[PDB]
CSV table of C-alpha atoms and ligand atoms in Angstrom, one decimal:
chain,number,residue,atom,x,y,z
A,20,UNK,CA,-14.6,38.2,0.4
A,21,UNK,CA,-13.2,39.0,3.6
A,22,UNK,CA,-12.8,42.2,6.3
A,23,UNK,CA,-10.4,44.9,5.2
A,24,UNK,CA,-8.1,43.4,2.6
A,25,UNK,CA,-8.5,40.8,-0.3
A,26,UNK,CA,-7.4,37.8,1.7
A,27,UNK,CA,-6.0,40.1,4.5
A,28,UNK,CA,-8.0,39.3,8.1
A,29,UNK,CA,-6.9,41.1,11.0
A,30,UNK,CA,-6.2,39.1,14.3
A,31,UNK,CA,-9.5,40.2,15.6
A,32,UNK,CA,-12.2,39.3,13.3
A,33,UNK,CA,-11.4,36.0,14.4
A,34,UNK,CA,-12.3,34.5,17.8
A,35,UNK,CA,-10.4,31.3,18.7
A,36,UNK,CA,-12.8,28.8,20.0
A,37,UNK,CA,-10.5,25.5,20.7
A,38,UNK,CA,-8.1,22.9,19.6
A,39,UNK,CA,-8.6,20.4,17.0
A,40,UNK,CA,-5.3,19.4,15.3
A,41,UNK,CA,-1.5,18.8,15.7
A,42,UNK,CA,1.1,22.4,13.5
A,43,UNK,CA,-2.3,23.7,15.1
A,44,UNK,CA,-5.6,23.4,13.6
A,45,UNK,CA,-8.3,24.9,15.7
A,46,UNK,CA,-12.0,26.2,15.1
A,47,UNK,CA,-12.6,29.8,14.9
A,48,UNK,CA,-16.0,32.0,14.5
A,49,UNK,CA,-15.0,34.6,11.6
A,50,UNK,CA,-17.6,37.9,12.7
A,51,UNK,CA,-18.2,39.3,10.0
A,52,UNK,CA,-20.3,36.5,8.6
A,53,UNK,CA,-20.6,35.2,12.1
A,54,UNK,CA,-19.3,32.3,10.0
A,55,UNK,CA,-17.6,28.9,11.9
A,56,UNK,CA,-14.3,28.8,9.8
A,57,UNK,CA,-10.9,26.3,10.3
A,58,UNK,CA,-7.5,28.3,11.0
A,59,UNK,CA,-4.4,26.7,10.4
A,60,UNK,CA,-1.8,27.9,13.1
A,61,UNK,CA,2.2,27.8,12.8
A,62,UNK,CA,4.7,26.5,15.0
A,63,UNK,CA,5.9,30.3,16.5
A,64,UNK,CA,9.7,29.1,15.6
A,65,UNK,CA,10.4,26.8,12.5
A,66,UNK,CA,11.9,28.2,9.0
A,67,UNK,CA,8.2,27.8,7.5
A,68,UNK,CA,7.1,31.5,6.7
A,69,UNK,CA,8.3,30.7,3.7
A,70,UNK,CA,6.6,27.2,3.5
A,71,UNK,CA,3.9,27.9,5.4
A,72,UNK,CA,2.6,30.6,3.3
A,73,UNK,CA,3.0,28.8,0.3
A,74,UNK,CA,0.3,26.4,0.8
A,75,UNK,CA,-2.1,29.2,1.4
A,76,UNK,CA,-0.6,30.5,-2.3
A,77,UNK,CA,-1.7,28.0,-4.3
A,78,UNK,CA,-5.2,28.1,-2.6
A,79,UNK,CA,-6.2,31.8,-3.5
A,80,UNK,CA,-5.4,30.1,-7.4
A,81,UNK,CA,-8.8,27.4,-7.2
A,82,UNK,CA,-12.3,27.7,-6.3
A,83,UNK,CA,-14.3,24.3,-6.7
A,84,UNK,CA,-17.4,23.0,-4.3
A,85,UNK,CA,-15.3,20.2,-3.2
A,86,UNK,CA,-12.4,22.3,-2.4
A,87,UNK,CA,-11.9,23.3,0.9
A,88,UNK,CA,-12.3,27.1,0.2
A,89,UNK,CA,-9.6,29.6,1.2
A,90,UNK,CA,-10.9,32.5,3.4
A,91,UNK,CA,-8.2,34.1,4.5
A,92,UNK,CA,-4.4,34.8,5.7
A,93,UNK,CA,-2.8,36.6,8.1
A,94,UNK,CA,0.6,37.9,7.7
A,95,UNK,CA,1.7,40.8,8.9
A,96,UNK,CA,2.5,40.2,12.5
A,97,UNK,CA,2.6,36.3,14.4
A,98,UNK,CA,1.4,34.0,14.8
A,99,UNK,CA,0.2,33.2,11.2
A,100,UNK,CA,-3.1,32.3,10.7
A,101,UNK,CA,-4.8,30.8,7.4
A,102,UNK,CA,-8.2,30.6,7.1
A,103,UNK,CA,-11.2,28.3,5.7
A,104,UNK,CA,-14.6,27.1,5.5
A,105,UNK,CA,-15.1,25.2,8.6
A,106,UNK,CA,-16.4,21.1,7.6
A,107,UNK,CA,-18.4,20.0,11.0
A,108,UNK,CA,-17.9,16.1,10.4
A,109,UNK,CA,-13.8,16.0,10.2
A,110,UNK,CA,-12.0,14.0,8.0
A,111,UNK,CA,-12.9,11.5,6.1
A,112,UNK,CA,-11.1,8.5,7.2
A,113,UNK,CA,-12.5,8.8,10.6
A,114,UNK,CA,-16.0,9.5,9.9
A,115,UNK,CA,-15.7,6.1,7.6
A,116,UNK,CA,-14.6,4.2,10.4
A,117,UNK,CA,-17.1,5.8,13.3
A,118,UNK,CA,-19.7,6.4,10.8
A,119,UNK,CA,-23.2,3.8,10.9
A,120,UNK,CA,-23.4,1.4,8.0
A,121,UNK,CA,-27.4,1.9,7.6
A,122,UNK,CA,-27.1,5.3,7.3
A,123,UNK,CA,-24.0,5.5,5.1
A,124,UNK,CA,-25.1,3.2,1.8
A,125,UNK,CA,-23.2,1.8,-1.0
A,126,UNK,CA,-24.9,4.6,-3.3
A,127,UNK,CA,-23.7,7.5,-0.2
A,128,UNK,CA,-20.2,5.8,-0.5
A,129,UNK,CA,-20.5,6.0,-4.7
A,130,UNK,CA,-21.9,9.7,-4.3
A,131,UNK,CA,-18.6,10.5,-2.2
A,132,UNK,CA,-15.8,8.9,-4.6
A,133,UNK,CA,-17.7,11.0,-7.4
A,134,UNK,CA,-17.7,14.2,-4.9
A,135,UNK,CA,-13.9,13.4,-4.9
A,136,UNK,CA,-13.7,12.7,-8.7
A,137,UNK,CA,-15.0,15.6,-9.5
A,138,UNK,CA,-12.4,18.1,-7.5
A,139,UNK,CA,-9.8,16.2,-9.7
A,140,UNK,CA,-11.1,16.8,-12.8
A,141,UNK,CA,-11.0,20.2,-11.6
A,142,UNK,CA,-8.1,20.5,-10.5
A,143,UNK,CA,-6.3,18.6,-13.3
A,144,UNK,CA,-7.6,20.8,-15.9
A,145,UNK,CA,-5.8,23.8,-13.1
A,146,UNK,CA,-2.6,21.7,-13.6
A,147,UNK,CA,-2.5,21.2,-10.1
A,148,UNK,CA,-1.3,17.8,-8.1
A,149,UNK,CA,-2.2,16.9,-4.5
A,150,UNK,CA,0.7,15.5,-3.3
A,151,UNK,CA,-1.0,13.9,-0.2
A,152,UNK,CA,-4.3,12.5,-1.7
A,153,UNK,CA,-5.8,10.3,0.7
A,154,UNK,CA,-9.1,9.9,3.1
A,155,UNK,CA,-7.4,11.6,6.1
A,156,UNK,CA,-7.1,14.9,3.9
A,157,UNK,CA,-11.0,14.9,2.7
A,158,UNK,CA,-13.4,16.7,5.3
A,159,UNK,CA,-17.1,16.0,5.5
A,160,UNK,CA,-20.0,18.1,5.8
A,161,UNK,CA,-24.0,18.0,6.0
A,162,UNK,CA,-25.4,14.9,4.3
A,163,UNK,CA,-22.1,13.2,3.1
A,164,UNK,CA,-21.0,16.3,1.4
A,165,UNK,CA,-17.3,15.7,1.1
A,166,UNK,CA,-14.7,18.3,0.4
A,167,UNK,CA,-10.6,17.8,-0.5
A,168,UNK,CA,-8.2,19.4,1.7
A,169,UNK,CA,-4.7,19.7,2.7
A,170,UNK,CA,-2.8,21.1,0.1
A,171,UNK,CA,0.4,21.1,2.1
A,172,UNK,CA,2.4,19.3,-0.5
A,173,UNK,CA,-0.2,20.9,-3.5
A,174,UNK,CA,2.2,21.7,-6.5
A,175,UNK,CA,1.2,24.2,-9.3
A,176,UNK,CA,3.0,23.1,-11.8
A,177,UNK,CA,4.6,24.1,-15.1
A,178,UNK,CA,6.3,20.9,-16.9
A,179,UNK,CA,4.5,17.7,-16.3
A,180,UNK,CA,6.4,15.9,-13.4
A,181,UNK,CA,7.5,17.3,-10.1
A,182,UNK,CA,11.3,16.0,-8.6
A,183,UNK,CA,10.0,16.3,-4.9
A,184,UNK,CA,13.3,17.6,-2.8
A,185,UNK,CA,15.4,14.4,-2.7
A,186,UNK,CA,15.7,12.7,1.4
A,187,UNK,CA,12.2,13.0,2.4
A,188,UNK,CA,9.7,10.9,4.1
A,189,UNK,CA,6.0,10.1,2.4
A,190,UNK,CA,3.2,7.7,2.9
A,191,UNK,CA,4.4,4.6,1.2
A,192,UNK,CA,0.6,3.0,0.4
A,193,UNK,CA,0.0,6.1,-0.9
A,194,UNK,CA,2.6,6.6,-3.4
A,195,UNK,CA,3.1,5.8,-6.9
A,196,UNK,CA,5.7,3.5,-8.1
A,197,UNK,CA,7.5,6.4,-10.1
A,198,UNK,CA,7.8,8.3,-7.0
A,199,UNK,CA,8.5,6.3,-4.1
A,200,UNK,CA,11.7,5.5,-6.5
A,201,UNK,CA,12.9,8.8,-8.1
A,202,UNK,CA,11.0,11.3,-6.0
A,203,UNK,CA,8.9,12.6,-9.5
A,204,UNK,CA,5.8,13.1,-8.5
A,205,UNK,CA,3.0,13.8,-11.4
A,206,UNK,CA,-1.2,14.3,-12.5
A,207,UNK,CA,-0.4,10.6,-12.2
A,208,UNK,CA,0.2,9.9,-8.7
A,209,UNK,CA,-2.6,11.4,-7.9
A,210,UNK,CA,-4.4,8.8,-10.3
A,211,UNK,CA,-2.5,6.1,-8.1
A,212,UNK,CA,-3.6,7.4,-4.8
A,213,UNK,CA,-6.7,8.0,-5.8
A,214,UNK,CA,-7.1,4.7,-6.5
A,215,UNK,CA,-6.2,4.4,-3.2
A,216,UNK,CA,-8.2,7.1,-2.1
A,217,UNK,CA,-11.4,4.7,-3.3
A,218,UNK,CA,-9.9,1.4,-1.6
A,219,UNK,CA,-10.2,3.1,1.5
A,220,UNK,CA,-13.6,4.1,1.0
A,221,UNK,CA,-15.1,1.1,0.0
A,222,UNK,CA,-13.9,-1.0,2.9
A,223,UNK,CA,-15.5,1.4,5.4
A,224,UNK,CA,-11.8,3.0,6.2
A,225,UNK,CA,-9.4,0.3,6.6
A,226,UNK,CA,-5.6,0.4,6.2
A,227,UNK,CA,-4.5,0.1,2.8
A,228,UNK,CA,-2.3,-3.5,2.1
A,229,UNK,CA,-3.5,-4.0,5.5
A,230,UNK,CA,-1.3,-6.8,7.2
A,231,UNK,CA,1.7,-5.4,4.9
A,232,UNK,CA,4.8,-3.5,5.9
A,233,UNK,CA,5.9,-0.6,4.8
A,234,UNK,CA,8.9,-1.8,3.4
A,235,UNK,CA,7.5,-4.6,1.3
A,236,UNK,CA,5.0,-2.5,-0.6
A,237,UNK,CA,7.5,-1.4,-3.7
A,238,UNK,CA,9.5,-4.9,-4.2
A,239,UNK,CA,5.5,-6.2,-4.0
A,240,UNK,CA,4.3,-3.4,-6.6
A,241,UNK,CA,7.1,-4.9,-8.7
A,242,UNK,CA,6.2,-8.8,-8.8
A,243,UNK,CA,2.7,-7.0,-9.9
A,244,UNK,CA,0.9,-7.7,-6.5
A,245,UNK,CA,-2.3,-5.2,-5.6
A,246,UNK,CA,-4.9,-5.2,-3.1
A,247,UNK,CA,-7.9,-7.6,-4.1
A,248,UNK,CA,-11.7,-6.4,-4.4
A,249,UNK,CA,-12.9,-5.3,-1.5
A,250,UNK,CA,-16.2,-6.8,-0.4
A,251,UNK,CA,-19.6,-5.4,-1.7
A,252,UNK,CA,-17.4,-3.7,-3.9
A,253,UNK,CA,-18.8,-3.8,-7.2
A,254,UNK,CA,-17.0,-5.1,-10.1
A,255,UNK,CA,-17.1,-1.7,-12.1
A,256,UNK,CA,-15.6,0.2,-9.7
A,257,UNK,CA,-12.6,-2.4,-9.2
A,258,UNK,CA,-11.6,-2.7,-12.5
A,259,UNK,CA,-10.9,1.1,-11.9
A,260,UNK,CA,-8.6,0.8,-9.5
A,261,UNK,CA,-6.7,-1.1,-11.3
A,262,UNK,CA,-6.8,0.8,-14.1
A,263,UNK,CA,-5.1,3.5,-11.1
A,264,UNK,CA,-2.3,1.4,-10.4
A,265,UNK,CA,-0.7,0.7,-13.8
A,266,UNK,CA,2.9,0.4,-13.0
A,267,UNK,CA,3.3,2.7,-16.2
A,268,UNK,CA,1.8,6.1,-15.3
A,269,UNK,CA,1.1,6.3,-18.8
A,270,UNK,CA,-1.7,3.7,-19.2
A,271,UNK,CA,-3.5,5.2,-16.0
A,272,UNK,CA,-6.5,6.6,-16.9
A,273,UNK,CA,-7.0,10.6,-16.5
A,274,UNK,CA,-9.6,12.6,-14.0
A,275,UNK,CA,-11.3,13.7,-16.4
A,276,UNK,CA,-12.1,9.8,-17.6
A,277,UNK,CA,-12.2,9.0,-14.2
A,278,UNK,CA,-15.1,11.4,-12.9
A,279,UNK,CA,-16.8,10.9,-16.6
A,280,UNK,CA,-16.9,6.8,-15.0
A,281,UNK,CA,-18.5,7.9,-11.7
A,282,UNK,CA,-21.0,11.1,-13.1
A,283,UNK,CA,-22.2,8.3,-15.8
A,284,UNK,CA,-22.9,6.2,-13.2
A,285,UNK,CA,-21.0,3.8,-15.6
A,286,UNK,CA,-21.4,4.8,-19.4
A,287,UNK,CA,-17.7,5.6,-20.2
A,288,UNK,CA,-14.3,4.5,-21.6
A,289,UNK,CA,-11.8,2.9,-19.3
A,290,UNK,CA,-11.2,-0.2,-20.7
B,17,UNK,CA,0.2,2.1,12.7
B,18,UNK,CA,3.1,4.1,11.0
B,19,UNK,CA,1.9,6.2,7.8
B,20,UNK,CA,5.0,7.7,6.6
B,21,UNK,CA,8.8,6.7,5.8
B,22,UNK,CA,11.3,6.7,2.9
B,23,UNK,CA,12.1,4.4,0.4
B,24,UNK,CA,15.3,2.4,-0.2
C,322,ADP,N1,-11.6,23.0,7.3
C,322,ADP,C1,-11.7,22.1,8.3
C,322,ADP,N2,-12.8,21.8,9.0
C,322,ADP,C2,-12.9,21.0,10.0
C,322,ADP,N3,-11.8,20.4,10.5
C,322,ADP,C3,-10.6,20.6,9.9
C,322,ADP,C4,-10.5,21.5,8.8
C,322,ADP,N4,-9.2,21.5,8.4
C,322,ADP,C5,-8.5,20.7,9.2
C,322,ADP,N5,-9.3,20.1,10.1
C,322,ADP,C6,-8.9,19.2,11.2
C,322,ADP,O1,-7.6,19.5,11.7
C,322,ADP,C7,-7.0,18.3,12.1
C,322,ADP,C8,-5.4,18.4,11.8
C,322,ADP,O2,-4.8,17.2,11.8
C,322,ADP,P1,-3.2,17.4,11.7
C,322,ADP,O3,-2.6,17.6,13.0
C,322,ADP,O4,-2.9,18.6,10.7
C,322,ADP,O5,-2.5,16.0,11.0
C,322,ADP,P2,-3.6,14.8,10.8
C,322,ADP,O6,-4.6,15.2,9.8
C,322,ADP,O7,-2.8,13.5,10.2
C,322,ADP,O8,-4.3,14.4,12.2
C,322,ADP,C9,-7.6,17.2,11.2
C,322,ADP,O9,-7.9,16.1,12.1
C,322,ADP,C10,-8.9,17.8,10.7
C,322,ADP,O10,-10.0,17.0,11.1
């Protein structure tokens, strides 16, 4: 719904107010709304007007709650802008760690994985993957509203696996087995990291196979190693992890059984 | 520490 154009904004309905990421992330008020809104910047001088734009392609496609929503583009001249709802709190991984344990309760931590589960679901259903699913890509908002964002790597998708271009460089803890070895990323990595995704939440925002190298994570997927249940952590919601890191994407679970285990609040099938 | 890397 913005200015003059569909997703069109004109330099000047925007007014810069500061830095807030590394290429450049910074914090905008969008007038006609008066609305505070994100704006994605790009490095002036770097073959990405092609990439670039992409990721602000796939956004005008979905419109969930726990999306981070897609207000805008600009195009026409440099530097390109893309802009979206603004999230107050940051990221999650942060907030996690900063964040007061009174005040953030195993029930606010629940209602977030669900939050997260449900933008899945979603997007599943879209045929759509996430290929960077992980707390530092989920942004915050008034009372533990969470939202997913970063859809840098975000796929559409026709077939059902993706052969991500071959000699590239992705966050190993993160990745599924399938991948990290013949670059084929799926619906079911996702799965993987979101099993991930839920590790890192329960433990407050620690670092995932914490103590582990990089390098030993695969050849330790292989002998069937995984992280153990993280503290207060309650039995239900382990044995779903698990069920997330099936060396076979095929007996992983799907979003769609995955948020029907959260909404439930435990009254459903993954077994 | 580091996040990202490739596999071998
Ligand atoms: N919609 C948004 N609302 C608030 N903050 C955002 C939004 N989108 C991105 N950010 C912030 O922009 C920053 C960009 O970080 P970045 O340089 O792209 O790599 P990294 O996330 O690993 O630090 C993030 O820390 C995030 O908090």
């Amino acid at each position: 719904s913005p200015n003059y154009d569909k997703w069109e904004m004109e330099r000047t309905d925007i007014t810069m107010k500061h830095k807030l990421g590394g290429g450049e992330v910074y914090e905008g008020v969008w007038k006609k709304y008066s609305l505070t809104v994100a704006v994605k910047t790009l490095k002036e001088d770097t073959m990405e007007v092609e990439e670039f734009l992409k990721e602000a392609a796939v956004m005008k496609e979905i419109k969930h709650p726990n999306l981070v929503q897609l207000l805008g583009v600009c195009t026409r001249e440099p530097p390109f802008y893309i802009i979206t709802e603004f999230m107050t709190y940051g990221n999650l991984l942060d907030y996690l760690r900063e964040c007061n344990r009174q005040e953030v309760n195993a029930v606010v931590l629940l209602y977030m994985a669900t939050q997260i589960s449900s933008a899945m679901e979603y997007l599943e259903k879209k045929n759509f993957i996430h290929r960077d699913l992980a707390a530092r890509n989920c942004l915050v908002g008034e009372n533990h509203l969470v939202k997913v964002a970063d859809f840098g790597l975000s796929r559409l998708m026709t077939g059902d696996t993706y052969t991500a271009p071959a000699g590239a460089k992705f966050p190993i803890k993160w990745t599924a087995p399938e991948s990290l070895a013949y670059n084929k990323f799926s619906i079911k990595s996702d799965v993987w990291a979101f099993g991930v995704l839920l590790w890192e939440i329960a433990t407050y925002g620690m670092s995932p196979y914490p103590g582990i190298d990089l390098s030993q994570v695969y050849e330790l997927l292989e002998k069937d190693y995984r992280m153990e249940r993280p503290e207060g952590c309650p039995e239900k919601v382990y044995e779903l992890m698990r069920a997330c890191w099936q060396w076979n994407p095929s007996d992983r679970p799907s979003f769609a059984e995955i948020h029907q285990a959260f909404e439930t609040m435990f009254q459903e099938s993954s077994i | 520490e580091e996040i990202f890397g490739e596999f071998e």
